[PDB]
Design a protein around this ligand. Sequence first.
Ligand SMILES: C[C@@H](CC[C@@H](O[C@@H]1O[C@@H](CO)[C@H](O)[C@H](O)[C@H]1O[C@@H]1O[C@H](CO)[C@@H](O)[C@H](O)[C@H]1O)C(C)(C)O)[C@@H]1CC[C@@]2(C)[C@@H]3CC=C4[C@H](CC[C@H](O[C@@H]5O[C@H](CO)[C@@H](O)[C@H](O)[C@H]5O)C4(C)C)[C@]3(C)[C@@H](O)C[C@]12C
Ligand SMILES: C[C@@H](CC[C@@H](O[C@@H]1O[C@@H](CO)[C@H](O)[C@H](O)[C@H]1O[C@@H]1O[C@H](CO)[C@@H](O)[C@H](O)[C@H]1O)C(C)(C)O)[C@@H]1CC[C@@]2(C)[C@@H]3CC=C4[C@H](CC[C@H](O[C@@H]5O[C@H](CO)[C@@H](O)[C@H](O)[C@H]5O)C4(C)C)[C@]3(C)[C@@H](O)C[C@]12C
Ligand SMILES: C[C@@H](CC[C@@H](O[C@@H]1O[C@@H](CO)[C@H](O)[C@H](O)[C@H]1O[C@@H]1O[C@H](CO)[C@@H](O)[C@H](O)[C@H]1O)C(C)(C)O)[C@@H]1CC[C@@]2(C)[C@@H]3CC=C4[C@H](CC[C@H](O[C@@H]5O[C@H](CO)[C@@H](O)[C@H](O)[C@H]5O)C4(C)C)[C@]3(C)[C@@H](O)C[C@]12C
Ligand SMILES: C[C@@H](CC[C@@H](O[C@@H]1O[C@@H](CO)[C@H](O)[C@H](O)[C@H]1O[C@@H]1O[C@H](CO)[C@@H](O)[C@H](O)[C@H]1O)C(C)(C)O)[C@@H]1CC[C@@]2(C)[C@@H]3CC=C4[C@H](CC[C@H](O[C@@H]5O[C@H](CO)[C@@H](O)[C@H](O)[C@H]5O)C4(C)C)[C@]3(C)[C@@H](O)C[C@]12C
Ligand SMILES: C[C@H](CO)OC[C@@H](C)OC[C@@H](C)OC[C@@H](C)OC[C@@H](C)OC[C@H](C)OC[C@@H](C)O
Ligand SMILES: C[C@H](CO)OC[C@@H](C)OC[C@@H](C)OC[C@@H](C)OC[C@@H](C)OC[C@H](C)OC[C@@H](C)O
Ligand SMILES: C[C@H](CO)OC[C@@H](C)OC[C@@H](C)OC[C@@H](C)OC[C@@H](C)OC[C@H](C)OC[C@@H](C)O
Ligand SMILES: O=c1ccn([C@@H]2O[C@H](COP(=O)(O)OP(=O)(O)O)[C@@H](O)[C@H]2O)c(=O)[nH]1
Ligand SMILES: O=c1ccn([C@@H]2O[C@H](COP(=O)(O)OP(=O)(O)O)[C@@H](O)[C@H]2O)c(=O)[nH]1
Lengths: 429, 427
Amino acid sequence: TTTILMLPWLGYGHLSAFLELAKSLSRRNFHIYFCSTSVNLDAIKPKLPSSFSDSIQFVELHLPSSPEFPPHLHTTNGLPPTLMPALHQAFSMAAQHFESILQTLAPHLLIYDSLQPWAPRVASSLKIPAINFNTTGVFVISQGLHPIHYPHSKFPFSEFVLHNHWKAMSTERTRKRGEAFLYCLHASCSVILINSFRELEGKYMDYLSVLLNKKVVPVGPLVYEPNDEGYSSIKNWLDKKEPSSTVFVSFGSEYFPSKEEMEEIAHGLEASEVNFIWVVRFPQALPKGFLERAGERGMVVKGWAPQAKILKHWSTGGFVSHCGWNSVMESMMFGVPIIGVPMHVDQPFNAGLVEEAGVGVEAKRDPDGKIQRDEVAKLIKEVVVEKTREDVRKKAREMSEILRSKGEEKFDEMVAEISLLLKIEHHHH
Amino acid sequence: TTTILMLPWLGYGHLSAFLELAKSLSRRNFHIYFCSTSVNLDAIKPKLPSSFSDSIQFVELHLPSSPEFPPHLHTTNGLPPTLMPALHQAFSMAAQHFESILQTLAPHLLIYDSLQPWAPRVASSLKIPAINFNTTGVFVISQGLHPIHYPHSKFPFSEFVLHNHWKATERTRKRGEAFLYCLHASCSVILINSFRELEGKYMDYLSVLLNKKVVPVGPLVYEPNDEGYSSIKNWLDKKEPSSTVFVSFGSEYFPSKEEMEEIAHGLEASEVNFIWVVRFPQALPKGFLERAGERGMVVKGWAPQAKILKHWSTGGFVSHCGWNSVMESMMFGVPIIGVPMHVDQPFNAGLVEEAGVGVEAKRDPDGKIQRDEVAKLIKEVVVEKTREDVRKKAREMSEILRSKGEEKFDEMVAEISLLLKIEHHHH
Ligand SMILES: C[C@@H](CC[C@@H](O[C@@H]1O[C@@H](CO)[C@H](O)[C@H](O)[C@H]1O[C@@H]1O[C@H](CO)[C@@H](O)[C@H](O)[C@H]1O)C(C)(C)O)[C@@H]1CC[C@@]2(C)[C@@H]3CC=C4[C@H](CC[C@H](O[C@@H]5O[C@H](CO)[C@@H](O)[C@H](O)[C@H]5O)C4(C)C)[C@]3(C)[C@@H](O)C[C@]12C
Ligand SMILES: C[C@@H](CC[C@@H](O[C@@H]1O[C@@H](CO)[C@H](O)[C@H](O)[C@H]1O[C@@H]1O[C@H](CO)[C@@H](O)[C@H](O)[C@H]1O)C(C)(C)O)[C@@H]1CC[C@@]2(C)[C@@H]3CC=C4[C@H](CC[C@H](O[C@@H]5O[C@H](CO)[C@@H](O)[C@H](O)[C@H]5O)C4(C)C)[C@]3(C)[C@@H](O)C[C@]12C
Ligand SMILES: C[C@@H](CC[C@@H](O[C@@H]1O[C@@H](CO)[C@H](O)[C@H](O)[C@H]1O[C@@H]1O[C@H](CO)[C@@H](O)[C@H](O)[C@H]1O)C(C)(C)O)[C@@H]1CC[C@@]2(C)[C@@H]3CC=C4[C@H](CC[C@H](O[C@@H]5O[C@H](CO)[C@@H](O)[C@H](O)[C@H]5O)C4(C)C)[C@]3(C)[C@@H](O)C[C@]12C
Ligand SMILES: C[C@@H](CC[C@@H](O[C@@H]1O[C@@H](CO)[C@H](O)[C@H](O)[C@H]1O[C@@H]1O[C@H](CO)[C@@H](O)[C@H](O)[C@H]1O)C(C)(C)O)[C@@H]1CC[C@@]2(C)[C@@H]3CC=C4[C@H](CC[C@H](O[C@@H]5O[C@H](CO)[C@@H](O)[C@H](O)[C@H]5O)C4(C)C)[C@]3(C)[C@@H](O)C[C@]12C
Ligand SMILES: C[C@H](CO)OC[C@@H](C)OC[C@@H](C)OC[C@@H](C)OC[C@@H](C)OC[C@H](C)OC[C@@H](C)O
Ligand SMILES: C[C@H](CO)OC[C@@H](C)OC[C@@H](C)OC[C@@H](C)OC[C@@H](C)OC[C@H](C)OC[C@@H](C)O
Ligand SMILES: C[C@H](CO)OC[C@@H](C)OC[C@@H](C)OC[C@@H](C)OC[C@@H](C)OC[C@H](C)OC[C@@H](C)O
Ligand SMILES: O=c1ccn([C@@H]2O[C@H](COP(=O)(O)OP(=O)(O)O)[C@@H](O)[C@H]2O)c(=O)[nH]1
Ligand SMILES: O=c1ccn([C@@H]2O[C@H](COP(=O)(O)OP(=O)(O)O)[C@@H](O)[C@H]2O)c(=O)[nH]1
C-alpha cells in the first residue's frame, strides 16, 4: 500500500483543501497520514466521514509551546494578527519533529503547502519524493511571478487592475518572503498541484508553467459537502424567506474586519433591504441599532456558521465574501453569485478572477482604500434584491453546471504523475 | 480480492441498474464479472467509464441461436413482443453455459435478477452464495405479495387503487411462484433499488411478508461523463427555462397507433415544447410534426435521456414510469407526467403521485389514454406551472437524493461480508 503524508499550512482553509485532496487519494487506494497541529486536527475532524478513517490517519505535529503561546493557538483560525510572526516562527521550529515523523512513518510521498520551504528539504534528506500542493487558484501566482520576468510589461490574458490599496500593502523583507514561497513551488518534484480547473484558469496555468519551467497539474474543484452546528435554527429562519432572497456574509477563518469596515458592510446590508446571515467573529462591533432596524431581515451568527449548508439553501441568492479561494470554489460549485469584499493576501486577485469570469461582482474600494457602503448596497440590490444582473446569475448557474459535471477523472493526472515519480525514484534508490 | 458475478435479466433497464450497482461494489474493492448476452453487453458498455474496466469485466452468456432468433435479438430492447416467450425460453436454456461460467470463474458471490429461478439453484450446487437484486422499487412487490397473505383486506399504508385496465389462473400463479422464488431463495437478504424516504414502510412490510431482510441500495442513477446530443442541446438551448417535456416509453414497449394518437394530440393541445423518442420494432397523426413546428422534436430509436432531463430547459417528463426513469427524474428534479403502460409501471406512477413529485394521466374506463388528460397535466405542471406544489416536492426530492453518498451501500457491503464469512466456515 502506497503511503502519502500530507502537510498543510496551519490555516483552516489550507487544512480543508488538503483534506479534500486526501479523500480523493484514499479513493484511489493510497494510505494517507494527515499531519497538523492538534488544534487544527480537532477542527477538521468533523469533515472526515468515518468511512475514511481506516485509510486517512491523523498525525500530530508538535510546535514549541509556552503558557504565552499554548497549543490551542497553533493555528491561524481566529488568531490575533500580531501572533502570526510567532506562529510562523514556531512552525519553522517544527522541522525537527517533522523529520522524526517522516523517519518513523517512512511515507512513500510527501505533499506539502507553500508556506514551509523546510518541508521539501527534510523530505529530500530522507530520500522521500515531495510534491507541492497550492490551495489558492492559479491567477494570483501567475500575477506575482510575471513581473519578475517582465518588469516593464502588462500582465497578459487579463484586464484586471489591482487597486492602489493593495499595491502598497523594506523591499528586501518582501523579496525574501517571495523567495521562500517560490522555493516551495520550484522545489516540487516534477509537478505542482493546484486547486483549480482549466475552464476557469487554463491560460494562467499554462503561463505559470512556462514561467516556473515546471508542469502545473490542476486537481480542482475541491469542495467539501457535508452529509447540528446551529444549522437547525438557521434552516428554520431561511425557510421563512423567499427563494434566492438572502445573502450569507463571511470573511473566512483568519480575518477580523475593523470597526470601520463593519460599519460600511452593515450600512450596505441595511440600504439594500436584503435578508442576510452574517458571521461575526472575535479573536481567540456593529453600529448602534443596526440589528434592531434590520428586524427579521437580518441574523448575526457568532463565531462560525455552516457555510456550505447555507450556500446550498434555496433561500440564498448571494454571498458577500472576502473571496478566500475555498469560499469562491464553494460558491461557484453551489451556483451562488459572489459579491466580493476582498481583504488581503490572495483575495483581491480572486475577486478579480470572479469578476472577469462573470460569476460575481466586486465591491470597489474608494481611492483611499476604504470599503463603500454605497457599492455594497448597489451590488446586493442588483444581484440579489432586484436581480437586474441576470447575466451574472446566468453565468453562475452555468459555472455550477460545469463544476457539478466533474468527477473522479479530475484526479487522473495527479495520480499518474505520482505513479511515475515513485517508479523513477524507486530506481534511483 | 473478493469476486462477484452479476446476472441481470436481459432488459436494458435491468443491465442499467446492475451496472450502477457493479460500480458501487467496484469502489468498495470488489472485482465484478458482469454477465449478459453480447447484444446487451454492447449496449451498456458506453455507460462504463474506462477507469472501471480493470475491476468490472464483461462476461458473455450464450443463449441458443438460430437464423430465426439470432444473437442480436437476445434482449428485450426493441424486441417484438411476440418474441418474449422465445427469449425467456432461451434464457432458461442458458443455465448450462451459466454453470460452466461459474465453474470457470469461481466467483465468491452471485448477484442475480428476479426473472431466473435457475440462477440461485446453479449457484447453490457449486456452493456459491447468491443474493437477489431487484431493479424495481418495493411498492409493486409488496402490493403483489399482500393479497396472498391477506386476501380480504385492503393493502395498508396506501390509498392507491390499480385501474381495472391492469387488473384483468394457473399460468398466472406459476409466474408469481417463479418471481417470488427468486426473492425467497436469496441468501439472508434481498437487495432493491429504492430508498427509505420514499418506500420505507413498504420495505418493512415486504420484509415481514417475505420473512427476509430487505436491504435498499438506492438511488441507483447513471449520470453521463455526440449520441445526437450536440444537436439536441443546441435546440434545447433556444427554449425558455423549464419549458420542455421529454417523452419516452423506455426500452421495451412500443405504444400502439391509438396510444400514440392520444399522446400526440395531448402534446399539441398543451402547446408545450417536446422531445419525443419514437421507436420501431427490431406512427404519428398526419400533420402533427408539421403543426408543431420548432416546438417539437422527434428522436428516432434512442435519445440521451439523462442529459435531456438535466437540461435547464426541461420542465417535465412524460414517462411510462419504468423505475430507472422515475429514479432519474427524481434525482434530476424533473416532475413526472405518468403514462404507465404495463408490468410495474402503473404501481410506480401511483407511488410518484402519492409522493407528490408527479402526476398520473388517468385512463378511460375501457383503458384508453385520454388526450385531454395528457394536455391538462402538461399545461398545469409545465406550461402554466399552476401545480407549484408538484414542482416544489420534485425539487425537495432532488435535494434529498443529491444528499446521498457512498453510505447507501454500507448495509449491502456488511451483509455480503457476513454472508461470505459464514459460508467460508461451512465450506
Ligand atoms: C531564492 C531561490 C530559493 C530560496 C531558498 O533557497 C534554498 O535554500 C537552501 C536551504 O534552505 C536549499 O537547500 C536550496 O538549495 C535553496 O534553493 C536553491 O536556490 C537557488 C538560487 O539561490 C536555485 O538555483 C536552486 O534551484 C534552489 O534549489 C530559500 C527560501 C530556502 O532560501 C528562489 C527559489 C525559486 C526561484 C528559483 C525562482 C523561481 C524559478 C526560477 C527563477 C529564476 C530563473 C528561472 O526561471 C526561468 O527564467 C528564464 C529567464 O527569464 C525564463 O526564460 C524561464 O521561463 C524561467 O523558467 C528559475 C526556474 C530557476 C526564480 C524567480 C529565481 O529568481 C529565484 C528562486 C526564487
Ligand atoms: C512562504 C511565505 C508566504 C509568502 C506569500 O504570502 C502568502 O501568499 C498567499 C498566496 O497568495 C498565501 O496563501 C498566504 O496566505 C500568504 O502568507 C501570509 O502572508 C500575509 C501577508 O503577506 C502574512 O500576514 C501571513 O503571516 C502569511 O501567512 C507572499 C508574501 C509571497 O505573498 C511565508 C509567509 C510568512 C513567512 C514569510 C515566514 C515568516 C517570516 C520570514 C520567515 C523566514 C525568514 C525570516 O524570518 C526570520 O525570523 C525572524 C523574522 O522576523 C527574524 O528573527 C529573522 O530576521 C528572519 O531570518 C522571514 C521574516 C523572511 C518565514 C518562516 C518564511 O520561511 C516563510 C514565509 C512563511
Ligand atoms: C419470474 C417471472 C416474472 C413474473 C413477474 O413479471 C415481472 O414482474 C415485473 C416486476 O413488476 C418485472 O420487472 C418484469 O417486467 C415482469 O416480467 C415480464 O412480465 C410481462 C407481462 O407481465 C411479460 O410480457 C414479460 O415476458 C416478462 O419479462 C410477475 C408475472 C410475477 O409479475 C418470469 C416472467 C416470464 C417467465 C414466466 C418465464 C416464461 C414462461 C414460464 C416459465 C416457467 C415455466 C412456464 O413455462 C412453460 O413450462 C411448461 C412445463 O411446465 C411447458 O409446458 C411450456 O412449454 C413452457 O412455456 C412458464 C410459462 C410459467 C419462465 C421461464 C419462468 O421460469 C420465469 C418467468 C421468467
Ligand atoms: C412455489 C414456491 C417455489 C417455486 C419454485 O420451486 C423451487 O423449485 C426447485 C427446483 O426448481 C428448487 O430446488 C426449490 O427447492 C423449490 O423451491 C422450494 O419451494 C418450496 C414450496 O414448494 C418452499 O417451501 C422452499 O422454501 C423452496 O426452496 C419454482 C422453481 C418451481 O418456481 C414459492 C417460492 C417462494 C414462496 C416460498 C412464497 C414466498 C415465501 C413463503 C410464502 C408462503 C408461506 C411463508 O410466508 C410466511 O407465511 C406466514 C403465514 O401467512 C406469515 O406469518 C409470514 O409473514 C410469511 O413469511 C413463506 C415465507 C415460506 C410463499 C407465498 C409460498 O406460498 C410459495 C413459494 C411461492
Ligand atoms: C537569484 C536569481 C535566480 O537564482 O537570480 C536570477 C536572475 C538572473 O534573474 C533571472 C531571471 C528572473 O531574469 C533573467 C534575466 C537576466 O533575463 C534578461 C532578459 C529579459 O534579457 C533582457 C536583457 C536586459 O537584454 C537582452 C539583451 C540580450 O539584448
Ligand atoms: C499579494 C499577493 C499575496 O498573496 O500576491 C502574491 C504575489 C505577489 O506573489 C508573489 C510571488 C509569486 O513572488 C514574490 C516575488 C515578488 O518575490 C521576489 C523574489 C522571489 O525574487 C527572487 C529573485 C531575487 O528574483 C530574481 C530577479 C532579481 O531576477
Ligand atoms: C393485485 C396486485 C395489487 O392490486 O397487483 C399485482 C402485481 C403487484 O403483482 C406483481 C408481482 C410483483 O406480484 C405478484 C406475485 C407477488 O404474486 C403473484 C401470484 C398471483 O402468484 C402466485 C403466488 C406465488 O402464489 C402464492 C400462493 C397463493 O400460493
Ligand atoms: O463561518 C464560517 C466561515 C468559513 N467556513 C469555511 O471555512 C473555509 C474558509 O476558507 P477560505 O479559503 O474561503 O478563506 P480563509 O479562511 O483561508 O481566509 C471555507 O471552507 C468555508 O466554507 C465555515 O465553514 N464557516
Ligand atoms: O431513448 C431512450 C430511452 C430510455 N433510456 C434509458 O433507458 C432506461 C430505461 O429504463 P426504465 O426502467 O425507465 O424502463 P424500461 O426500459 O425497463 O421499461 C433508463 O436508464 C433511461 O434513461 C435512454 O437512455 N434513452
